[PDB]
Design a protein around this ligand. Structure first.
Ligand code: XG4
Ligand code: MN
Ligand code: MN
Length: 430
DNA sequence: ATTATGACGCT
DNA sequence: AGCGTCAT
């Protein structure tokens, strides 16, 4: 009872840009705004592959991973923007720079953890304590939460979407105890006020819209963010968890969408996250290992301890290219030329990183995939990265992979390579 | 012939 | 160190 800690110590937000690459292209080209639009890489094969889709286009069934020619079958007026090509490969520099714009704005409010190119976690606990001090017990006006949903409300005792939103928000605000500066629900509410302000700043200063989740930990904040996309934020309280999880497929929780989640379902004969509560911590550890078992026991009760890392920059800088089917690399000249192309892009990104961020990579990881291997990587080898020089980097990558070529002939490469991947790692302050 | 990344756990 | 999992 009283000693049963409830995982309500922190206020954590997850901010995720809506259809990010599409918004970057729509900012640049106003003719694409408020249209069914998608972003593609390459063009020759089946019109290129879609990696981002505006919400107007999603209404027609267009999705990521779809070939553009097939998307056009669902949505003949779909507009398309292509990712830049440089040195023979996709070049994502425009989107990385746009990401930096957004991350620098978020960092004004709190220290952030960059979780992907378009989303970050925020630990708002301290900022909330400060805003609460300023409020002096003043209640929170619904006007301060103009885009916030309260998950689970309204309940009990109505036709439009905004009206339901406001109804739920009114129920939440009316039930709040604002004289208690340690009430977790009040703390989440103040966190949501701050996130409204953060999202307003991002849109004013970049033109980009985003969604957000506010809860007591990272997993719940991420789940909350997706409940009301686009251009809205969602508060998931500790009390909302039993009902939310009672019908929540296990695969919707981040990290359970793969083999482990499938094993949870199959071994335990369950479907929904809330069903996990009926097992003891030791039972879960017995099936899924000590770490996963403890994590599942706490997570199905809404509790998670993973901290928001103070990390605004990526930990690695990498360059990769697939060579599918008949384009697979089958000569030594070919393998060298593409290693050089990747190495030249890597050098350009690394030099810019050293200038911006006062650090230097020290290890180069070379990964290849070989024809007939279904795995992502067939082989990974590391070497030292001592100079930001593309010719040296590519010569070293060739040296560390050259023993793969099973061909007796010096010129041929067998079996042919279907992927090259160079990744700079182990950064040190410079 | 999804592709280009990036984080992180295991041994 | 090199491999596997998860995400998307
Ligand atoms: N190159 C590449 N980029 C990708 C891939 N998948 C996603 N991206 C890029 C393109 C995406 O714009 C961006 C962010 O990924 P999300 O947050 O998962 N999707 P979004 O922001 O589009 O829509 P939502 O409003 O539902 O969040 O990452 C991929 O497989 N390959
Ligand atoms: Mn997004
Ligand atoms: Mn994202």
């Amino acid at each position: 009872g009283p000693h049963m800690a409830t995982g309500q110590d922190r206020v954590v937000a997850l901010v995720d840009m809506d259809c990010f690459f599409v918004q970057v292209e729509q900012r640049q080209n106003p003719h694409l705004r408020n249209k069914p639009c998608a972003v593609v890489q390459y063009k020759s094969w089946k019109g290129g592959g879609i990696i981002a889709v505006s919400y107007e286009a999603r209404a027609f069934g267009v999705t990521r991973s779809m070939w553009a020619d097939d998307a056009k079958k669902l949505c003949p007026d779909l507009l398309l923007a292509q990712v830049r090509e440089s040195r023979g490969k996709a070049n994502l520099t425009k989107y990385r720079e746009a990401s930096v714009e957004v991350m620098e704005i978020m960092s004004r409010f709190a220290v952030i953890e960059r979780a992907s190119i378009d989303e970050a976690y925020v630990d708002l606990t301290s900022a909330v304590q400060e805003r609460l001090q300023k409020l002096q017990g003043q209640p929170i006006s619904a006007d301060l939460l103009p885009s916030t949903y309260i998950e689970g409300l309204p309940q009990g005792p109505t036709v439009q979407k905004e009206g339901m939103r406001k109804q739920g928000l009114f129920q939440w605000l009316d039930s709040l105890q604002i004289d208690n500066l340690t009430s977790p629900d009040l703390q989440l509410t103040v966190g949501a006020v701050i996130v409204e302000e953060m999202r307003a700043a991002i849109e004013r200063e970049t033109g980009f819209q985003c969604s957000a989740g506010i809860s007591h930990n990272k997993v719940l904040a991420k789940l909350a963010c997706g409940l009301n996309k686009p251009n809205r934020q969602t508060l998931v309280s500790h009390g909302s968890v039993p009902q939310l999880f009672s019908q929540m497929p296990i695969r919707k929780i981040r990290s359970l969408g793969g083999k482990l989640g499938a094993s949870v379902i199959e071994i335990l004969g369950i479907e929904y996250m809330g069903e996990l509560t009926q097992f003891t911590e030791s039972q879960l550890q017995s099936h899924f290992g000590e770490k996963n078992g403890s994590w599942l026991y706490a997570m199905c009760r809404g509790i998670e301890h993973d901290p928001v890392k103070p990390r605004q920059l990526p930990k690695t800088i990498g360059c990769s290219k697939n060579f599918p089917g008949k384009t697979a690399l089958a000569t030594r000249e070919q393998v060298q030329w593409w290693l050089l192309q990747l190495a030249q892009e890597l050098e350009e990104r690394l030099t810019k990183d050293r200038n911006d961020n006062d650090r230097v990579a020290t290890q180069l990881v070379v990964s290849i995939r070989v024809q007939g291997d279904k795995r992502l990587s067939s082989l990974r080898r590391c070497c030292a990265l001592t100079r930001y020089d593309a010719h040296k980097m590519s010569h070293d990558a060739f040296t560390v992979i050259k023993n793969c070529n099973t061909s007796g002939i010096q010129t041929e490469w067998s079996p042919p390579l279907t992927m090259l991947f160079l990744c700079a790692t182990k950064f040190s302050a410079s």
